[PDB]
């Protein structure tokens, strides 16, 4: 009823509607990178009290329709250690004690994995702390080869 | 046999390949008693080992 | 190993991780004489501002 000079309508003449701050922009924000929540199975199976909550989310990666074929194949090849036996991508986090923060962290992890799996021209940072010994062992195993014919 | 690979009993071990009654060099004429099975080391486990007992 | 455990043993692949024992810390006294400010963070559970009755 009361309104002064510093009112919400006078300072912004373009925004004077009664529902301009509650209109959900669903029709202009429905891209493929939204991650549908109806096909995700989020469950909480930990209640520690070292107070940290666990938020495990899994979904069938082979039946995901919101993901293209090449990016799906790339993210399945480069992350073949987190795939369950039934084709379930199990991703969990253990940082905060709240379930909302863990869910947001899992969503951010999924988003960065998706945005890095599609980008194939990615410069890999050459590390020398844990892969050097692996490369040395692989080279030494490949060096000891000097036969002529073997099948099987 | 694999000295490292048994998940249940720590002191025991698993069996992979086993032969018997090998006519000298003929390693293809003797009877079979245990089908060959490739090693299956765990992920977080260390470095397993398999010895050939002849 | 995944394919072996899948189409050779009819089970799931077990995973492990080389864990380490927790670090040693003396008994937290009431008045830590001559100790840095980070002495309370050594025995702190979570690094988040907790609130009780508020």
């Amino acid at each position: 009823e009361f309104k002064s000079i510093y009112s919400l309508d006078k300072l912004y003449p373009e925004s004077q509607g009664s529902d301009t701050a509650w209109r959900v922009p669903n029709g202009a924000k429905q891209a493929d990178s939204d991650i549908p929540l109806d096909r995700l199975t989020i469950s909480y199976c930990r209640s520690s009290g070292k107070v940290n909550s666990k938020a495990e989310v899994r979904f069938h990666l082979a039946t995901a329709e919101w993901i293209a074929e090449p990016v799906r194949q790339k993210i399945a090849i480069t992350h073949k250690n987190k795939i369950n036996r039934l084709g379930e991508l199990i991703l969990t986090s253990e940082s905060s004690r709240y379930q909302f923060r863990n869910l947001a962290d899992c969503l951010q992890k999924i988003r960065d994995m998706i945005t890095e799996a599609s980008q194939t021209p990615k410069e890999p940072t050459k590390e020398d702390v844990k892969l050097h010994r692996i490369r040395i062992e692989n080279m030494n195993r490949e060096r000891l080869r000097q036969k002529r014919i073997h099948s099987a | 046999t694999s000295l490292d690979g048994h998940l249940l009993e720590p002191d025991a071990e698993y069996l992979h390949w086993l032969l018997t009654n090998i006519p000298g060099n003929r390693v293809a004429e003797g009877q079979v008693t245990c089908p060959y099975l490739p090693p299956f080391p765990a992920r977080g486990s260390g470095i397993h080992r398999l010895a050939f007992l002849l | 190993v995944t394919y072996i455990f899948h189409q050779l043993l009819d089970m799931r692949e077990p995973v492990f991780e080389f864990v380490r024992p927790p670090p040693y810390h003396p008994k937290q006294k009431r008045f830590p004489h001559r100790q840095p400010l980070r002495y309370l963070d050594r025995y702190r559970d979570s690094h988040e501002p907790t609130y009780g009755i508020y």
């Binding site: - | 249940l8 720590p10 080992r49 | 492990f16």
Partner: peptide, 24 residues
């Protein structure tokens, strides 16, 4: 249940050439 799932939570290794191969 599968009887072959006897994994146990603790797994030991009886190989002396193991700790130095993992840089631990």
């Amino acid at each position: 249940p599968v009887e072959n799932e006897a994994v146990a939570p603790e797994f030991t290794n009886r190989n002396p050439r193991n700790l130095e191969l993992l840089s631990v």
